[PDB]
Amino acid sequence: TTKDVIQKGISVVGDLLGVVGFPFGGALVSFYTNFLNTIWPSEDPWKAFMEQVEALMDQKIADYAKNKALAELQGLQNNVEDYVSALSSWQKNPVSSRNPHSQGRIRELFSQAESHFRNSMPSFAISGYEVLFLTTYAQAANTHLFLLKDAQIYGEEWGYEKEDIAEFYKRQLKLTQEYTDHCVKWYNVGLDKLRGSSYESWVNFNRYRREMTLTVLDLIALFPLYDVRLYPKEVKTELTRDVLTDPIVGVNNLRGYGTTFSNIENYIRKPHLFDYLHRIQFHTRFQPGYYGNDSFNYWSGNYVSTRPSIGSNDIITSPFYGNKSSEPVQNLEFNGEKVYRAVANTNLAVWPSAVYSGVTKVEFSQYNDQTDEASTQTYDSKRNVGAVSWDSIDQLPPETTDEPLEKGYSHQLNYVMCFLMQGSRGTIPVLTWTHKSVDFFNMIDSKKITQLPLVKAYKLQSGASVVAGPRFTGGDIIQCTENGSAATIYVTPDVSYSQKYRARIHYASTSQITFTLSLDGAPFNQYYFDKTINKGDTLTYNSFNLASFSTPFELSGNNLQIGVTGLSAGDKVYIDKIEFIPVN
Numbered sequence: 001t002t003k004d005v006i007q008k009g010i011s012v013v014g015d016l017l018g019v020v021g022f023p024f025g026g027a028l029v030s031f032y033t034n035f036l037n038t039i040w041p042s043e044d045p046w047k048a049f050m051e052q053v054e055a056l057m058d059q060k061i062a063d064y065a066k067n068k069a070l071a072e073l074q075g076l077q078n079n080v081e082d083y084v085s086a087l088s089s090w091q092k093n094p095v096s097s098r099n100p101h102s103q104g105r106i107r108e109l110f111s112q113a114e115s116h117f118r119n120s121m122p123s124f125a126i127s128g129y130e131v132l133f134l135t136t137y138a139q140a141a142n143t144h145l146f147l148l149k150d151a152q153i154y155g156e157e158w159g160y161e162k163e164d165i166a167e168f169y170k171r172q173l174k175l176t177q178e179y180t181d182h183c184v185k186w187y188n189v190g191l192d193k194l195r196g197s198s199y200e201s202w203v204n205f206n207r208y209r210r211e212m213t214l215t216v217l218d219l220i221a222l223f224p225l226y227d228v229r230l231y232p233k234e235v236k237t238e239l240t241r242d243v244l245t246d247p248i249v250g251v252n253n254l255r256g257y258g259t260t261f262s263n264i265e266n267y268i269r270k271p272h273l274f275d276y277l278h279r280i281q282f283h284t285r286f287q288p289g290y291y292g293n294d295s296f297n298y299w300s301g302n303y304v305s306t307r308p309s310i311g312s313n314d315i316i317t318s319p320f321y322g323n324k325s326s327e328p329v330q331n332l333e334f335n336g337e338k339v340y341r342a343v344a345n346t347n348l349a350v351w352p353s354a355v356y357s358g359v360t361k362v363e364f365s366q367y368n369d370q371t372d373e374a375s376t377q378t379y380d381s382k383r384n385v386g387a388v389s390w391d392s393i394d395q396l397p398p399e400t401t402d403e404p405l406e407k408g409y410s411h412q413l414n415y416v417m418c419f420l421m422q423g424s425r426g427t428i429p430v431l432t433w434t435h436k437s438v439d440f441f442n443m444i445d446s447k448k449i450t451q452l453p454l455v456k457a458y459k460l461q462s463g464a465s466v467v468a469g470p471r472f473t474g475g476d477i478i479q480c481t482e483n484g485s486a487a488t489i490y491v492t493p494d495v496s497y498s499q500k501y502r503a504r505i506h507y508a509s510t511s512q513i514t515f516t517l518s519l520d521g522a523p524f525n526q527y528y529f530d531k532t533i534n535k536g537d538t539l540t541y542n543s544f545n546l547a548s549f550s551t552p553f554e555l556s557g558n559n560l561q562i563g564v565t566g567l568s569a570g571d572k573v574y575i576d577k578i579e580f581i582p583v584n
Helices: 003-016 025-038 044-057 064-092 100-124 134-148 148-152 162-192 201-219 261-265
Strands: 243-244 275-287 296-310 328-332 337-351 356-367 371-379 387-391 410-422 426-434 448-452 463-465 477-480 484-490 500-509 514-521 520-530 545-550 558-563 571-584
Touching: 003 025, 003 044, 003 134, 003 201, 003 558, 025 064, 044 064, 044 162, 044 201, 044 520, 064 100, 064 134, 064 148, 100 134, 100 148, 134 148, 134 162, 134 201, 148 162, 162 201, 201 243, 201 261, 201 328, 275 410, 296 337, 296 356, 296 410, 296 426, 356 426, 356 477, 477 484, 484 571, 500 514, 500 558, 558 571
Parallel strands: none
Antiparallel strands: 243 426, 275 296, 275 328, 337 356, 337 387, 337 410, 356 371, 410 426, 448 571, 463 477, 477 571, 484 558, 500 545, 500 571, 514 520, 514 558
């Protein structure tokens, strides 16, 4: 259920990833038409977003509050539509038909929509309904900010005053911080409200966390890239966060035998440097049926192997998960393949006073981007397979229903972990996924501004570590606690010639520091950076600063190393991303 809003959520993020930074006019208009068809066609999508959180929370919005919200939204739709039609005409029409009279038409259509947005937002955040209105607020906030940046692109063309364009910019800065902070605060409120002790508690908790990531958190991560003044070129970026699909179970009610909340949550993957699915070792066991004829084999445990980010080749192998094999082990290798789908079969044996169920078959759909070919690899228990009961596509829809799945998919498999049920009743498999936007090669685009997340490093040092992200950066961050090296990240230049770049760093620091950059062990850039927070402080939007390094440089190597100095005992530095600006 709700796959509709999940697909809309996934698609918008996917589309926006193409018009992030300063977009080209044709691309901007194209986006807008899909945008209107997806998010702003009627009240139906808005109604579905409200029902979505009501489902997750098991609470309802007071009819009066639901109706007002919907009323504001109908009005905002007209404003957006009227604006887009006019913008479309403006782009299409030559720099001749632009008379003072048509400029004033577009200027007031814009002013109306923008103003209507500021006036309506509080309706999506009424006291006591903040969490329930989260996806609605997130989608409305996004529209408002995306709309705002147009004033910086077309402001002068439309004949706006210098003062007007400036007022709009300051307004954009204030709202980017507020809307971001609002979403994270209530996201966390909702998350904590769902923490429990039971297996059933964890499934709800994790479903909320996954659905809020796809519809809210991924979205807010793009907001800063709507600043066309800081980002005067197109931006190449990616989302590095993990999402966990619902556990694969044969029965709807485990009658208390489900793994406890703590035995799942405390054991899922902790903040880690980015990696890729490399190998899986399937362990199978025999489940006897009370009458023999109803027996079946099932997936009892597993091993998982991942390969690190580009620059390192040593394979990481996981501890054993679940129960040892009673049957012959099965190994599937993924070197180069991207698993874009997983479909499972489950089976059950009904005993006089017990029910035993397990995952009997798993079919993986893979795509080879090198040899541009799709294929499948499957796990089979070999005894009494039963029918398909779990499809990843229902939880992780494709970005586009236009193209074939091997082209339009939104996520790929990263991890597999087997949990044991209580009182040796079976095995519960749990799958972790990563976004399609992640670039394996860490490629520096010669025409765009390239954002490189530090979690894409292959090596940490001097006691640097991966820490949970503040929820608004699209992934995790690096914490530095000592003076010295911190991280080594491998970089792939896209051009052969001596292209020059400027580097920018998105960080948070308790003190004034020095960042040093090295290529293949040779320093090339060193600069002084300001303190952004006090020791103790929690990380909110304003905690981070984006600062440039003075001197331009060429990519005369691949191994980029970031080093920090100027720390005192108790000081901490958080690094989010390094950016590259193609310069002449």
